[PDB]
Amino acid sequence: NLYQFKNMIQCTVPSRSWQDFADYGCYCGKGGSGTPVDDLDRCCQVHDNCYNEAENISGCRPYFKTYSYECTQGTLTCKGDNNACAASVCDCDRLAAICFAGAPYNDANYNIDLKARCN
Numbered sequence: 001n002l003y004q005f006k007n008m009i010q011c012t013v014p015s016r017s018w019q020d021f022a023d024y025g026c027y028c029g030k031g032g033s034g035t036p037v038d039d040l041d042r043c044c045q046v047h048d049n050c051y052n053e054a055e056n057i058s059g060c061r062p063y064f065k066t067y068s069y070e071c072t073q074g075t076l077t078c079k080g081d082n083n084a085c086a087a088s089v090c091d092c093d094r095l096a097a098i099c100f101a102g103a104p105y106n107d108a109n110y111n112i113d114l115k116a117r118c119n
């Protein structure tokens with residue numbers, strides 16, 4: 001769930017407050033339309049899709065599902081005790097968190113006008 005995702009970020013990208021990722025580009029946060037303004041936006045685009053895919057599994061709600069995972073000594077691990085749904089979301093979240101750490105941050109891309117720039 002979002003809390004867990006929020007926590008995967010704080011551990012993967014300590015140097016940056018998680019809210020910097022809450023509303024950025026066209027995909028990070030809400031929205032799922034338009035052209036990803038940059039690599040970091042691409043990370044979120046892939047993330048949004050992943051979630052969408054996970055939604056196909058019955059009763060599976062990526063924002064709310066509580067899954068099992070851990071982050072220590074620089075490693076993020078989705079544990080073996082996750083059912084299909086949990087396993088999927090966790091992986092969605094884990095992959096995004098890793099992508100985030102590797103993606104450059106462009107202050108100009110924070111809080112952009114979705115209605116006008118993501119069509």
Ligand SMILES: O=C(O)c1cccnc1Nc1cccc(C(F)(F)F)c1
Nearest residue numbers: 006018019021022027028029030044
């Ligand atoms: O999408 C991301 O990458 C993200 C990253 C950090 C925090 N929040 C994020 N998203 C996000 C998306 C919808 C609603 C919320 C909210 F509930 F906090 F408002 C957060």
Ligand SMILES: [Ca+2]
Nearest residue numbers: 027029030031
């Ligand atoms: Ca989104």
